[PDB]
Amino acid sequence: HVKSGLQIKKNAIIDDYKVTSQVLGLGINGKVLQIFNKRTQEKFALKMLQDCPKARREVELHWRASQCPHIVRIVDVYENLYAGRKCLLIVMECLDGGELFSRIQDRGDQAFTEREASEIMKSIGEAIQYLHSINIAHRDVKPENLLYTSKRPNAILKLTDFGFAKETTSYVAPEVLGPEKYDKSCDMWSLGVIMYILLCGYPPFYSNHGLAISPGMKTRIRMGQYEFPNPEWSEVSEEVKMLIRNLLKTEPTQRMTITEFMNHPWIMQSTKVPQTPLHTSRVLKED
Amino acid sequence: VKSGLQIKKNAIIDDYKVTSQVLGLGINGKVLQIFNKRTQEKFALKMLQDCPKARREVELHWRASQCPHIVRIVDVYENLYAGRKCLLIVMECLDGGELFSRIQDRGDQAFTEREASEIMKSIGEAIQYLHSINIAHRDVKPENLLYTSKRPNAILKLTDFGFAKETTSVAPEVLEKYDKSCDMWSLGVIMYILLCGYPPFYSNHPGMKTRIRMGQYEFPNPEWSEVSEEVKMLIRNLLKTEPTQRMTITEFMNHPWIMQSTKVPQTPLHTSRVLKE
Amino acid sequence: VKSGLQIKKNAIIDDYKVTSQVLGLGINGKVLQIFNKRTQEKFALKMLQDCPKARREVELHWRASQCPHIVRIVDVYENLYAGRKCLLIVMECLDGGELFSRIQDRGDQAFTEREASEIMKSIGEAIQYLHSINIAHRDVKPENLLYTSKRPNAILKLTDFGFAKETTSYVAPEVLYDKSCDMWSLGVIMYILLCGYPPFYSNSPGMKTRIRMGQYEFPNPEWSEVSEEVKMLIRNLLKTEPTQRMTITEFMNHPWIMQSTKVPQTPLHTSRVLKE
Amino acid sequence: VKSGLQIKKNAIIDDYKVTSQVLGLGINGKVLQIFNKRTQEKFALKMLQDCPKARREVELHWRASQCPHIVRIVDVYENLYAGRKCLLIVMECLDGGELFSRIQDRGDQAFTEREASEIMKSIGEAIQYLHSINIAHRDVKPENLLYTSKRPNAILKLTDFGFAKETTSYVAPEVLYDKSCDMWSLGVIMYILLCGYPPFYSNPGMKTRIRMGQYEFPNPEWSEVSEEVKMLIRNLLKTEPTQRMTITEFMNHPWIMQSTKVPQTPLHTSRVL
C-alpha cells in the first residue's frame, strides 16, 4: 500500500557499474547502452539524460509507474557530473528479448494467432490502466517502446521510455476532479494502432511509396480513413474490428477509455478468443 | 409569460410569525418552518446574506419556480438583520421528507422498477426545464429532493439553487460547457441508487476518488440481477467519465424506460431493504 | 498538383459583356449572368468589395473548385469600381435551380428514399473534399445547393464560400467546431429531404430552444414508412454535442449513403409537402 | 548547531508498523499512533499530501523542534501512496491529552491561579522560541496543546504547524501582523484558563463582539482573580494588532516570570469547563 520514493544517488555510477568512456558517450547521444553490475556480472540498461526540468519529470513519473511490472523497472538513478555538466543516469532492468514486432516477425513459420494478439493487448492495457489510475499519460506508446525481457519463450513484455509522460492533473462528477484535457485518450489511440498492427502486420495509416510521414498519410489520419482489407482481415471478428474502430476514433472524446478497454470481452478473456491464424508474421517478415 | 422577481422590502415579520431565534438558526443556514399571520398556513424559510451569489440563487431559483417539480418560492424579502442587508426566501413547505428516507419507510407493497422510473421521470422533468432555460442545477443530490406532503400522492420537488449557474453566455453550438452535463451525471448516480439501494462509487473503509475518475463500478448480484441491460445501458450512458459522451436531458426524457414508465415491469427491487439497513 | 489562383487585373469588360446595370446589381450581392465575348458562352458573376474576408473566400473557393461537386470558379478579377478596389468572380453558371426547387417541380411522380440517399451522398462528396483539405464551408443550406442544369444528368453543386474557414493551424489526429457544423447541416438537409420540412422551425426564441435542446420528432404520416436506419443516422448528425456528431468519412461509409441500391424505393411526402 | 532535516525515502514500513488501516485515515488529517519495529516503542504519525504547503510545514516544524515545548519530529518520510507523492511525519507521541481535557477532569476548585500562570509560562516559552527564529505558529488553539504523558508533571507541548509562516523574507527593528496573532491567542487561552469559557462566544454577533473587542470579566468567576492578570489579558486581546504586547514583554510580565510569587486562589475553571 505504501511505496518507497525515489532516492537519486550522487556517487559515481562507475563505482557500481562497469561504464566505459565509450558507451557513456553514446549515452548523451540518446543511445541506450548495456552495462554490467560490478558486484554481480548481471546486465542492465543505462539511459542518460542531462539534468534538466523535463528529465526530472521523466524519472519521477517513471519511478511511480515502476510499481507496475508491465513497465520497465528502474533499478537506480544517478545524478553525476559528466563533461562538466550535471546529468541524470537511469539504470533499468535490461530488456533483452527485443521489440514486440521483431519477436513476432522473426519466428516463422509459427503463425501468430489472434489469441496471442489478445494476450499481448491485454498486458499493454494493464500497464496503461495502471498509468491512468495514477494520472500519468504515457503519450509515446509505440512498438519501439515495448520490449521483451528475454528471448525466453515466457518473457514478459514491458513499456519503456517516459520522456513524454505527463501528470494528467495538478455524486461529484469525475471532471469536477481535475482537468479533462485529453492526453489519456491518445494512449488509447495508440493501443488502437498497435492492436491493428498485431492483427495484420501493418499500420492502419501508412505511406504508399513509403515510408516517411506522407501528406497523403496525414490527411488519411486526420480524416480517419483506413480499412480492414482482405486477405489479412478476412478471418478476424467484427467484434475485434469494432473495438479497433472505437479506439481509432478521430474525436478524442469519442474514444473508449482504458477501463472500458480492459472490460471488453476480447481483452478480458483472451484465453477464450479463437486461435485463428494471422498474416502478421509473414507481412512483418516481408518488411 | 411569467412574472419577474419582486423582492419585498418590508420586514418579513409584517407577514409571518418569525421567531428571532428561528432567525438565528436561519442565519446558520437552516431551513425553518414558519407561519402566515392572515392565513396561519405553514411555509419554509431559508436565510442568506445578500451578496452576488445569493442574488444569483434567488434569481435562478425564481425562474426555475415555474416548473412545479421545483420547490415553489412564495416571496423573497430583503431585510436588515444584525446590521447587514440579507435575503429571506419564503418557500412552500415540503413536508414529505427526502426521496430515500421515504422509500425506506415502507413494507405494504413492493417498491418496484416502475416506481423508480416514474421517480426518475419527474426529477428529469425538473432538470429538463432548468436546462431548457439554460440553468444548470449542479447540486442534484438526494438531500435536495423533498416530497411535498406525506400523502401517497405526494409530488417530489428539487431544492437548493445555491450552486445553480446560467449556462448561457444554425448549429446548436453556434447559439455552454460541462455544467449541464454534471446534472446528468447526478441523475445517473441517483438512478443507480434508486434501483439497488447503494451508490455506484463509495469508500469501503482516494480509492473512491480513483474509481470515480476511472469509472469503475459494478452492477453486482443479487440486487442488479433482475434489472435489464436497457436500464443498465442508460445508467452507463449517464455515468460516462468524459462529460461530452454523456446523454443530454432531452435524450434521457425520450428514453423508452422514462418515456414509457407505464410499460415498465413492476418487478420488485432490493432498494428499500438495503436503504433501511 | 494544380495551379494557384492568378487574379486578373485587367478590366473584366475586356473579356465579358458586363453591363453597368448588372455591375450595380452585382454590387448588392446579386449573382448575375454574363457572357464571354470570344465565345458568347454563359457565366455567373458575383462581386465583392475587396477586403481580407473577401480575399479569404476567393482563396478557399479556388482551392475547393478542384472538386466537381463545387461550383467552378472560372476567373477572379480585381478591378476599380466606384473608385474602390473590388473582386469580381466569374463562375460556371448553375442553371438548374436550387435542390428543393427541382424536387418540388416534380409531382406526382414518386420521390423515393433511395433518391434521397443518392442526393445526400452527392452533397457528402462535396463536404468530404473540403474537410480533407481542411476547409469548413459553414454555410451548407439548401439555397447553396444549385443544379448545373435541368438536363437529366445535371449535377448538384455546393456554392457560396463566404463563411468558409481553414480548419487548421502512430500519432494521434488531435496532434497533426467548424467541420462538425457542416455535419449538423447535412442532417438538417437530409431531414428535410425525407419529409419536406425542417427538423426545427419557427415558433423563434422558442426555436433556438428546440435547437439547443435537440427537440425534434419524426412525426406521422410522413416518417412512418421511412427506415429506422435513416432515423438513427439523422439522430447522430443532429446531435447537440458537436464532438458526439459523426464525421464526414463516417457519413460516406454509412450503409445508407454507401450502398444506396439497397435503400428501398419507398415513396416520400417530400414533393407533396414542399409544394404546400 | 543541530542536524538538518533528512527526509527518508525508504518505505516507512521498513521501520514502523503502519497498518494500512491508518494510512487512508491519516491521509485525511487524523493523527495515528504507530510503533517502531525494533523497539516497539510507540509514536505518532501525521500524513500530508506532498505539496509546497506541506513542505513548508515540515521545514518550519523541524526548526521549531529543537525547543522541547514543541512536539518533537522523529523523522520524515517521502513515499508513494496510491501513486501520489506524500510526506509522512513521525513525531514523539503525546499521550497525556489536550491541555483542557485534563483541567476538566480536575476536582472542583483544585486548579489554581498559580497553576494557570505556570501553564501560560509554559505555552509562552514555545511562542518565544518560534518568534525568535522568525516563525509564527498562527494556530495556537487548545487542541494543539497536548500533554506528553499522564504523569502529574507531564510537560505540555505545542503541535500542528500547518499554518506557520516565516515572519520574514542603532538600526530600528523595523529596518530589518503574524506574531501578533499568536499573542492574541495566548490571550484567549489565558482567559479560558482562568474561568472556563472564552472571552468571545455565543449562548453570529460573536463576530461583532470580537471585531468590537467586547468581552467582560463576569463574576462570580472573575471575582477573586487578581487585577494585574485581568490587565495582562486586556493587552493581549487588544483589537488593534500593533497595540498588543510582544512575546518578550509577556515572558517578562511579573505574573508570568514569577509564578512562584502568584497566589494559589482557586478558579471555577474545572467546574465551569
Ligand SMILES: CCOc1ccc(Nc2c(C)c(N[C@H]3CCCNC3)nc3ccnn23)cc1
Ligand atoms: C548489446 C545490446 O545492448 C542492449 C541490450 C538490451 C537493451 N535493452 C533495452 C533497450 C535496447 C532500450 N532501447 C530503447 C531505445 C529507445 C526506444 N525504446 C527502446 N531500452 C530499454 C529499456 C530497458 N532495456 N532496454 C538495450 C541495449
Ligand SMILES: CCOc1ccc(Nc2c(C)c(N[C@H]3CCCNC3)nc3ccnn23)cc1
Ligand atoms: C494494405 C496496406 O499496406 C501497406 C502499405 C504501405 C505501408 N507502409 C508502411 C508499413 C508497411 C509499415 N510497416 C511497419 C509496421 C510496424 C513495424 N514496422 C514496419 N510502417 C509504415 C509507417 C509508414 N508507412 N508504413 C504499410 C502497409
Ligand SMILES: CCOc1ccc(Nc2c(C)c(N[C@H]3CCCNC3)nc3ccnn23)cc1
Ligand atoms: C418541523 C418543521 O421543520 C421543517 C418542516 C419542513 C421543512 N421543509 C423543507 C426542508 C426541511 C428543507 N430542507 C433543506 C435543507 C438543506 C438540504 N436540502 C433540504 N428544504 C425545504 C424547502 C421547502 N421545504 N423544505 C423544513 C423544516
Ligand SMILES: CCOc1ccc(Nc2c(C)c(N[C@H]3CCCNC3)nc3ccnn23)cc1
Ligand atoms: C453493498 C455495496 O457495497 C457498499 C460499499 C460501500 C457503501 N458505502 C456507502 C453507503 C452504503 C451509502 N449509502 C447511502 C446512499 C445514499 C442514501 N443513503 C444511504 N453511501 C455512501 C457514501 C460513501 N459510501 N457510502 C455501501 C455499500
Ligand SMILES: CCOc1ccc(Nc2c(C)c(N[C@H]3CCCNC3)nc3ccnn23)cc1
Ligand atoms: C437569368 C440568369 O440568371 C441567373 C442564372 C443562373 C444563375 N446561377 C447561379 C445563381 C442564381 C446563384 N445564386 C446564388 C445566390 C446566393 C445564394 N446561393 C445561390 N449562384 C450561382 C453560382 C453559380 N451560378 N449560380 C444565377 C442567375
Ligand SMILES: CCOc1ccc(Nc2c(C)c(N[C@H]3CCCNC3)nc3ccnn23)cc1
Ligand atoms: C410538422 C411541422 O410542420 C412545420 C411547421 C412550420 C415549419 N416552418 C418552416 C417550414 C415549413 C419550412 N419549410 C420549407 C421552406 C423551403 C425550404 N425547406 C423548408 N421552412 C422553414 C424555415 C424556418 N421554418 N420553416 C416547418 C414545418
Ligand SMILES: CCOc1ccc(Nc2c(C)c(N[C@H]3CCCNC3)nc3ccnn23)cc1
Ligand atoms: C490512535 C492512537 O491514539 C493516539 C495517541 C496519541 C496521539 N498523540 C497525538 C495526537 C492525538 C495528536 N492529535 C492532533 C490532532 C489534531 C489536533 N492537534 C492534535 N497530535 C499529536 C502530536 C504528537 N502526538 N499527538 C494520537 C493518537
Ligand SMILES: CCOc1ccc(Nc2c(C)c(N[C@H]3CCCNC3)nc3ccnn23)cc1
Ligand atoms: C458566562 C458566559 O458563559 C458562556 C456561555 C456560552 C459560551 N459558549 C461557548 C463555550 C462555553 C465554549 N466553551 C469551550 C471553551 C474551550 C474549551 N471547550 C469548551 N466555547 C464556545 C465556542 C463558541 N461558544 N462557546 C461560553 C461561555
